[PDB]
Design a protein around this ligand. Structure first.
Ligand SMILES: [Cl-]
Ligand SMILES: [Cl-]
Ligand SMILES: [Tb+3]
Ligand SMILES: [Tb+3]
Ligand SMILES: [Tb+3]
Length: 185
């Protein structure tokens, strides 16, 4: 399920992260997401708490958007992009077919349309419609040829770690925080 935020629930602006830091865990590699919320009104707190209760009762995952990485540097319909099959390692080659505008930058997020792993772009070079995107970590799969690139709206597939650890009498709740980790399976 989707972690509620001001984009799924604009009526709860307090669900916008006040601080987020992306943690690199290398024992395979996975991202840690530490979220700290601003002062939450009671309705916002109860809705967040009830959604996390739903998450626990369903055994589902928590999909998380980090808007601080949504730069929309690459635009266009990606379903006509071609990712040749058989690729693995730290670089992925795409053929844009001239259907994408703008270019990605090192530090942007990246994922494949068929797999939930999120990567960081570490380097970008191009030759015409050939894009050479270096990734971190290495690809978790070998491309089949049907994958499509995802630059915008990237969701992290996570699980909640500290389900209990962390009333400011403005009526609100202060110091609320969530510890999340990208889940392997
Ligand atoms: Cl091609
Ligand atoms: Cl190249
Ligand atoms: Tb703020
Ligand atoms: Tb503040
Ligand atoms: Tb391998």
């Amino acid at each position: 399920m989707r972690l509620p935020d001001p984009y799924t629930n604009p009526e709860y602006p307090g669900l916008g992260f006040e601080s987020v830091n992306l943690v690199d865990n290398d024992p395979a590699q996975y991202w840690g997401i530490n979220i700290s919320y601003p002062e939450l009104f009671p309705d916002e707190y109860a809705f967040l708490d009830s959604r996390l209760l739903e998450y626990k009762r369903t055994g589902d995952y928590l999909d998380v958007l980090l808007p601080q990485y949504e730069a929309f540097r690459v635009r266009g319909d990606t379903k006509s992009v071609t990712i040749p099959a058989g690729q693995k390692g730290s670089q992925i080659i795409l053929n844009t077919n001239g259907t994408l505008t703008g270019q990605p930058k090192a530090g942007d997020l990246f994922k494949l349309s068929t797999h939930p792993k999120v990567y960081k772009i570490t380097n970008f070079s191009s030759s015409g419609n050939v894009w050479n995107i270096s990734l971190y970590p290495d690809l978790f799969i070998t491309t089949t040829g049907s994958e499509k690139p995802v630059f915008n709206g990237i969701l992290f597939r996570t699980k909640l770690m500290n389900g209990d650890s962390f009333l400011n009498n403005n009526g609100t709740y202060s110091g609320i925080s969530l510890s999340l980790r990208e889940s392997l399976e």
